[PDB]
């Protein structure tokens, strides 16, 4: 509906300036005190959530990409294991560095979103190095 | 440019230069920094733009980190193949065998590629330093596995190049050190 | 620039046992050159005083 779409763009509004301002422990702090930005409006906190998990699966998988072109994974299991520690460890890390609940949906929403596709990104960039 | 070193300097730059643009933009053509259309415009895709200078970012640690490694691998090997009388004793080509073998196990050298580059500058730094035309041969029969083969020093490098770093070890001693030349050329 | 200079490889001897700190790794200035490199170095500073200047040259083979 259109009340629904308004509604979901000011979200997007406020989740943006949300992350532009309030440094990660500035964010953390104020989650705690209640004294933060627009944190009446649930469809603001879950833009925000969401925007949080598609930073942190962004920096999760840019690590195992560097360490994939530096050539450190000698075979393609080694490269599995790592990346599957990694992304399980990464979830929490970033989640209560932004006191965020890391079980949050709206979170895993953001984080696990088109994990096949990076899949596929560094299983491409592996076999480069494996030839 | 490279001028962040770190994450977290390049995190603390681009909040504060964030915080103050706005305001530095807002009241250079008369608008309220505090809008909400001005702050639509500002704060619009901010995560996509904040994914694309952590890329640009992490490329450049990367590639510091490599060059860092590079240097600490030779000033940690210069500890014990400086000295002419270190390069003499065949305990040297076995710390310099092990030392490749046990960074390459625990990950303190991460790539073959890494170690290659090792290998070639120890053995660039060897060749020119007395006592070492002795390391060399030594250390020339000593096994290194790198991409899935093990080999000798001396198969690694090839057999031409081999007889070149030789003749390089061997005559460099006349050539960094007058005296030498001096003494030989009188008698 | 202090190759090509007289007195250049009393000055680039003396800073080559000092530190310098890049990319995270301490060296001195002699470690971050080369070895061979640094022998190249020292050669053309110390040879070059008698290519720029034909009097040094001049006096050193007449003696």
Do not use: C
Not at chain 1, 19 to 37: V, Y
Not at chain 1, 84 to 105: M, T
Not at chain 2, 50 to 79: P, T
Not at chain 2, 102 to 114: E, F, H, K, M
Request: hydrophobic share 30%; aromatic share 8%; no cysteine.
């Amino acid at each position: 509906t259109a009340k629904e779409q308004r509604a979901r763009d000011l979200a997007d509004e406020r989740s943006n300036e949300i992350i532009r301002k309030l440094t990660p422990e500035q964010r953390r702090e104020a989650l705690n005190n209640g004294t933060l930005l627009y944190q009446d409006d649930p469809y603001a906190m879950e833009a925000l959530r969401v925007k949080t998990g598609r930073n942190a699966a962004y920096l999760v998988d840019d690590d195992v990409m560097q360490k994939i072109k530096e050539g450190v994974f000698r075979t393609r299991e080694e490269m599995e294991e790592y990346r599957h520690s990694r992304l399980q460890e990464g979830a929490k890390v970033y989640a209560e560095q932004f006191g965020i609940d890391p079980e949050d949906v709206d979170y895993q929403r953001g984080f696990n979103g088109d994990i096949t596709e990076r899949n596929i990104s560094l299983y491409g960039a592996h076999d480069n190095f494996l030839s | 440019e490279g001028v962040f070193r770190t994450r977290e300097e390049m995190e603390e730059y681009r909040h504060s230069r964030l915080q103050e643009g706005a305001k530095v933009y807002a009241e250079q053509f008369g608008i309220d920094p505090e809008d909400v259309d001005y702050q639509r415009g500002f704060n619009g895709d901010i995560t996509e733009r904040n994914i694309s200078l952590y890329g640009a970012h992490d490329n450049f640690l990367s590639q510091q980190a490599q060059k860092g490694a590079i240097m600490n691998s030779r000033v940690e090997l210069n500890g014990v193949l400086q000295d002419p009388d270190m390069l003499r004793r065949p305990d040297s080509a076995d710390f310099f065998e092990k030392y490749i073998d046990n960074g390459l196990v625990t990950g303190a050298i991460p790539s073959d590629a890494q170690a290659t580059q090792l290998i070639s500058q120890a053995f660039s730094d060897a060749s020119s330093r007395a006592g070492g035309a002795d390391f060399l041969m030594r250390v020339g029969d000593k096994k290194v596995t790198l991409n899935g083969a093990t080999t000798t020093y001396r198969e690694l490098i090839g057999e031409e190049q081999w007889n070149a770093l030789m003749v390089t070890a061997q005559r460099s001693q006349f050539e960094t050190d007058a005296k030498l030349n001096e003494q030989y050329r009188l008698k």
